[PDB]
């Protein structure tokens, strides 16, 4: 299990990883010092003696060059010592183990690998500084932020080995994934929180930038587009030029909630050909969603075109935003005084509502719902009455947040964050839970020794009344501490169960592969499915289409 099914192996490397907004999707920053070490065995041939003899001469120490040259007899000429090292006449059907160069294929993975996608061929850019660099949007399917995760790289040794990476494993060909019959690489962070900021109706670029951004895009036809605004001053819309990014015959339709061909909320999305017509560009459009641009552009134009598309959007968005700025102050969690009265007067009517149910339960009026403890339908009654107080006070602070709010704005792009995060940060944190019950009695009939026995109310059983801004209290702290802990606990062993499952899951279907009769079988040749997935179709290409023979009136049908 540790030496045949998985071997230690040569021709490989590993460093830390860092995000490079100026790399093509399918590329990989190899630290020079690594590129100086790994070696492809290349053959002597009329096509190459020239680039090659050069490299042999170049030496195993300045960059493009080689250690070792290999002969007729098959003996090892060692290019870091050897008397005839600034010499050597390369003689056809010999081998020059050169360094790794730009545009080579490489298998680049991240543990733990739970995908075909956690192993992808990348192109090579030899660079300065010793971090392995990659384009943000090759993030999701490796699952690596830059907080300090390491990453692995392997280098092929036969020509065919190359092919096999560059035709099957190569990143672009992964962009829309079997698993979920949708894409898996997206528009992430800044670019996301930017490609919205850029897009708002109010966002007008003027000439100076407009020209640069144009330049900035690498495939730009050199034909400036006519400005939306021509009046007192010639301006362009955000949408206006982003559009330059988008190729041709790319069509796209949405409609959100209030979306009426005019979308007076800039709702939905309409993309006619290389251009954009109305509505904000955000996650639903530009993230690795289903109906979205990436899923389109791939099936439409190619992997390659889409692959490129990534770079294009960023190279621009990055730029626009680079000059615009963005941030988050604590003032982005503050909210109105007259709301900070409503939030508290919304808690204090839920607290005084638990108090009555509590007082009623104690007068044995509280009716037992069918099939459950009298206590059980107090425990449930309260939790519901406290979660409600939160979402309520929470949402009461989503309504107070202005449009100029940064936090509120990332959420709008869906760059990071959600509701809860606001409610937590600005209004009230919530009920703590351990094995899904509000804080237990560890001490006899109480929670802390600062409490009296037989106290069931929210302040005593783990309700954190306060926000993160206002500040937790001693008890509150200690409770929330109790909870959060549980988080850490399982993640150190929810994963150990998960990881057993997978190994089994994998070890059991392993060798099931469609055969050349389209039947689906194992090594015994026993059918499992007579056609793959009940229709002999590969998952990738498939997408969600409405069968509108189904709904509608018998009437509306005939019409």
């Amino acid at each position: 299990r540790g030496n045949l099914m998985g071997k230690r192996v040569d021709f490989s490397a590993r460093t830390v990883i860092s995000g490079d907004p100026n790399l093509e999707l399918d590329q990989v920053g190899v630290p020079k010092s690594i590129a100086k070490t790994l070696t492809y065995p290349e053959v002597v041939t009329p096509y190459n003696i020239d680039r090659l003899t050069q490299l042999v001469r170049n030496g195993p120490n300045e960059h493009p060059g080689a250690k070792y040259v290999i002969r007729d007899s098959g003996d090892r000429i060692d290019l870091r010592y050897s008397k005839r090292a600034g010499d050597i006449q390369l003689q056809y059907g010999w081998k020059v183990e050169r360094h790794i160069m730009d545009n080579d294929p490489v298998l680049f993975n991240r543990q733990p690998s739970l995908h075909k996608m956690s192993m992808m061929a990348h192109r090579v850019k030899v660079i300065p500084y010793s971090t392995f660099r990659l384009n943000l949007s090759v993030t999701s399917p490796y699952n690596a932020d830059f907080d300090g995760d390491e990453m692995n790289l392997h280098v092929p040794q036969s020509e065919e080995t190359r092919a096999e990476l560059s035709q099957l494993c190569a990143v672009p060909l992964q962009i829309v994934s079997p698993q979920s019959n949708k894409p898996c690489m997206g528009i992430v962070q800044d670019t996301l929180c930017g490609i919205r900021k850029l897009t708002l109706r109010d966002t007008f670029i003027e000439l100076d930038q407009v020209l640069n951004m144009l330049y900035w895009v690498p495939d730009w036809d050199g034909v400036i587009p006519t400005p939306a605004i021509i009046k007192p001053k010639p301006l362009w819309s955000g949408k206006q030029i982003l559009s330059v990014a988008i190729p041709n015959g790319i069509h796209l339709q949405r409609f959100d909630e209030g979306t009426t061909l005019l979308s007076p909320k800039d709702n939905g999305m309409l993309i006619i050909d290389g251009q954009i017509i109305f509505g904000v560009v955000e996650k639903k459009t530009v993230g690795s969603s289903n109906g979205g641009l990436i899923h389109v552009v791939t099936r439409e134009k190619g992997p390659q075109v889409c692959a490129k598309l990534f770079g294009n959007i960023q190279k621009v968005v990055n730029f626009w935003l680079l000059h615009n700025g963005f941030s988050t102050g604590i003032g982005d969690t503050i909210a109105d005084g007259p709301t900070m009265r409503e939030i508290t007067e919304t808690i204090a009517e839920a607290k005084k509502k638990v108090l009555d149910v509590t007082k009623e339960a104690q007068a044995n009026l509280l009716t037992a719902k069918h099939g459950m403890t009298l206590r059980e339908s107090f425990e449930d009654n309260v939790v519901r009455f406290l979660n409600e107080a939160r979402d309520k006070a929470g949402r009461l602070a989503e309504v107070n947040l202005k449009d100029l709010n940064n936090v509120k704005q990332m959420v709008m792009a869906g760059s990071k964050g959600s509701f809860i995060n606001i409610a937590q940060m600005s209004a009230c944190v919530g009920q703590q839970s351990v094995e899904g019950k509000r804080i237990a009695f560890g001490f006899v009939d109480r929670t802390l020794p600062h409490f009296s026995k037989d106290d069931y109310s929210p302040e005593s059983k783990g309700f954190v009344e306060n926000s993160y801004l206002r500040g937790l209290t001693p008890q509150e702290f200690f409770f929330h501490a109790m909870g959060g802990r549980e988080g850490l606990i399982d993640t150190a062993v929810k994963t150990a169960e998960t990881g057993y499952i997978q190994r089994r899951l994998v070890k059991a279907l392993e060798d099931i592969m469609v055969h050349y009769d389209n039947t689906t079988r194992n090594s015994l040749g026993n059918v499992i499915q007579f056609i793959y997935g009940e229709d002999g179709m590969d998952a990738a290409h498939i997408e969600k289409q409405s069968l509108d023979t189904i709904g509608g009136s018998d009437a509306a049908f005939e019409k």
Partner: protein
Amino acid sequence: EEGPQVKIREASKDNVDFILSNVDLAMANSLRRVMIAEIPTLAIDSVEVETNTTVLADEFIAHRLGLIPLQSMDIEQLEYSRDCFCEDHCDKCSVVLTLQAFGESESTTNVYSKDLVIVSNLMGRNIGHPIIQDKEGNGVLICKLRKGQELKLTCVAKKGIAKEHAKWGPAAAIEFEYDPWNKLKHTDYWYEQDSAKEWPQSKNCEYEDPPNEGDPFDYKAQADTFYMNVESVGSIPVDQVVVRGIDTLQKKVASILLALTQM
């Protein structure tokens, strides 16, 4: 004169507060950058070490010594050590210096940059003098020593520029504001009630004019006037920083002009 209109209000040995009327913003900037980055200077850049029983390690002090403010007045006639035809250094490219001290007393012996000592021929140019702005008269504080600790050193200071290391930089903080009321609306101020009872009025809001509620947006207007202020470390005095900035900017613009001729 003809165009770019400078005007000082307050000025000193280290501060030049000045409007800079009638320019492109694009420029004003490039001026400030080239100011911080590309104006050559002298500072230590090679430490030969005889003895050091300090509580500090060798390569620390060597670092400390780098930063020390040395006279770059006549600097623009000292020759780049990369250029000058001599094997390592010479007095045509370098001012060599010496530091020794030695614990003499019980009570902690300091080691100031006044204790620095030129050795090589100055050919009579004004260069390489450890600058002291200190009132007491002891520039910087290299290191400290107890009863029996030596320190023997050999500084070879060479021409260089901030782009190569912030030692060779001859500035620090460069104050920079334009259009103090947002008349150009280049910014979008963030608020909870009155944008103007929430942010502060910058000292620069007197020279210029208020907006007056009734007036609409002035769109076609651009960037004039740049409320700058240059502080100085003081290898080069304030006036020469701005002077030589303008200068080196112009100088390197020009190398392109020459490059185009040479093709």
